[PDB]
Amino acid sequence: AYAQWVIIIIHNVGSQDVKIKNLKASWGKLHADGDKDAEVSASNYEGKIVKPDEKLQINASGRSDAAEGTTGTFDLVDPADGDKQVRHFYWDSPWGSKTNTWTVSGSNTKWMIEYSGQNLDSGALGTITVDTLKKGN
Ligand code: NA
């Protein structure tokens, strides 16, 4: 029963560009770094490239005065391979004592993806770092 939020940090730790697509919060809203009430457009991120050694930070929060959590999805795609999907991502940080969800799905064996930081218990889902590396087949 507290304010729900997530921060997703995509860190490209490989040598090949990765691209974000289809970023959509189904509950709550995307917001600016360090201000959970300052809504931003998904077009700030849609189609953006994360270059080698760069980070891209996405922040989402619920409507904390309406007992609302935040839920959303995005894809990473490979801009050198026709925007082939790398992985699909899903977050859910429901309001209350409810368990959170952070799911990475899909397959693309040219890429390795590692994540950590998620809080799956009660409370906000929190800060999740996603490391991306194109390893080839
Ligand atoms: Na929660």
Swiss-Prot record:
InterPro entries: Aegerolysin-typ (IPR009413)
Superkingdom in the source lineage: Eukaryota
UniProt keyword annotations, A-Z: Cytolysis, Hemolysis
One BP annotation, GO: symbiont-mediated hemolysis of host erythrocyte
Keyword Zinc: no
Function: Has hemolytic activity against bovine erythrocytes at nanomolar concentrations in vitro. Promotes active pleurotolysin B (PlyB)-dependent permeabilization of membranes rich in cholesterol and sphingomyelin. May play an important role in the initial phase of fungal fruiting.
Family affiliation: Belongs to the aegerolysin family.
Subunit structure: Monomer.
Protein name, as recorded: Ostreolysin A6
Organism: Pleurotus ostreatus (Oyster mushroom)
Gene encoding the protein: OlyA6
